[PDB]
Design a protein around this ligand. Structure first.
Ligand SMILES: CC(=O)Nc1ccc(S(=O)(=O)C(C)C)c([C@H]2CCCN2C(=O)[C@H](Nc2ccc3c(N)nccc3c2)c2ccccc2)c1
Ligand SMILES: [Ca+2]
Lengths: 55, 254
């Protein structure tokens, strides 16, 4: 399920026993209730450009 | 970087400039406040391990604007499988003496999970390569940080699409091809250790490291980058490890 279109996840993907899928995020991000989206929890999360984000 | 453009100040915030005795040495990628990912071949000629400096927030080499942060390289960790004078397993993980302070100009690049890197990031065509290396073959290095977008190529296509030059190293499972064969666009020896960064759903990740190639933007030859996905577990275990006395440390691989 994860092998196909990142399993719907924005970031990380874990396959479970059966038709179960768990999306996860890199440290400095929290997962949203949609269970796919990652939102920053910090001022400078990795992979984001502050001059471009603050624009 | 040959055929690229100037990376606007603050737009490559993870880029590291590695200095040895105040002189330009290599690039690197900040992955958190205390760790930098570079290439092992950068340290092949180092005698003065105490004179290694990493510069974050750098853009223009001729001017200090106050956004630069220098840190002594406390440790250089190289895989046991890396043989000096060769191309395979060309990765190094550096521990900075004290953390960097995250600012608009100093931001880490995301080190991805093996799973996501292999099954998702490996299929994003275009990724950005950067450094203050040569702007041309046998030409001058950049004063301002340059960036170039390069297409990733499958190894079989990379072998088929390249001019069969003898004595050339083999492209391994710990490396990949990216760039162009027309001699117009590449990264070169001065960009070594620098990032090959990949965009996926509004976040950039580390997928490769400026490693090796033929000359500099040579016709019929692509650029070769370390396949970072093979080193995730290796980097993570070490990032969780206590510092050892000495600058150069050789760690088992895998
Ligand atoms: C094997 C070996 O020559 N080892 C080695 C160890 C140390 C050193 S060094 O001491 O100066 C160090 C401080 C950089 C060097 C320096 C000096 C000689 C060349 N060099 C490089 O780094 C070359 N790098 C690149 C990188 C990306 C390339 C690309 N995308 N396209 C085209 C060519 C590209 C070349 C390079 C070319 C071929 C193999 C490896 C690196 C080499
Ligand atoms: Ca400067």
């Amino acid at each position: 399920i994860c092998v196909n279109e990142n399993g719907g996840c924005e970031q990380y993907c874990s396959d479970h026993t059966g038709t179960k899928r768990s999306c996860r995020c890199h440290e400095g991000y929290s997962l949203l209730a949609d269970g796919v989206s990652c939102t920053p929890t910090v001022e400078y999360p990795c992979g984001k450009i502050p001059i471009l984000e603050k624009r | 970087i040959v055929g690229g453009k100037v990376c606007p100040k603050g737009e490559c915030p993870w880029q590291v400039l590695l200095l040895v005795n105040g002189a330009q040495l290599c690039g690197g990628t900040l992955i958190n406040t205390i760790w930098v990912v570079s290439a092992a071949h950068c340290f092949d000629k180092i005698k003065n391990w105490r004179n290694l400096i990493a510069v974050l927030g750098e853009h223009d080499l001729s001017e200090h604007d106050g956004d630069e942060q220098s840190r002594r390289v406390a440790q250089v960790i190289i895989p046991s499988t890396y043989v000096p004078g060769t191309t395979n397993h060309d990765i190094a993980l550096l521990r900075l003496h004290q953390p960097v302070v995250l600012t608009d100009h100093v931001v880490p690049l995301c080190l991805p999970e093996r799973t996501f890197s292999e099954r998702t990031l490996a299929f994003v065509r275009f990724s950005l390569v950067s450094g203050w290396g040569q702007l041309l073959d046998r030409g001058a290095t950049a004063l301002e940080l340059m960036v170039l977008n390069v297409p990733r190529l499958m190894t079989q296509d990379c072998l088929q699409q390249s001019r069969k030059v003898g004595d050339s190293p083999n492209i391994t499972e710990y490396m990949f091809c990216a760039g162009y064969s027309d001699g117009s666009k590449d990264s070169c020896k001065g960009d070594s250790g620098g990032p090959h960064a990949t965009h996926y759903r509004g976040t950039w990740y580390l997928t490769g490291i400026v490693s090796w190639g033929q000359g500099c933007a040579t016709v019929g030859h692509f650029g070769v980058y370390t396949r970072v996905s093979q080193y995730i577990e290796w980097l993570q275990k070490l990032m969780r490890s206590e510092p050892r006395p000495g600058v150069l440390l050789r760690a088992p691989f895998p």
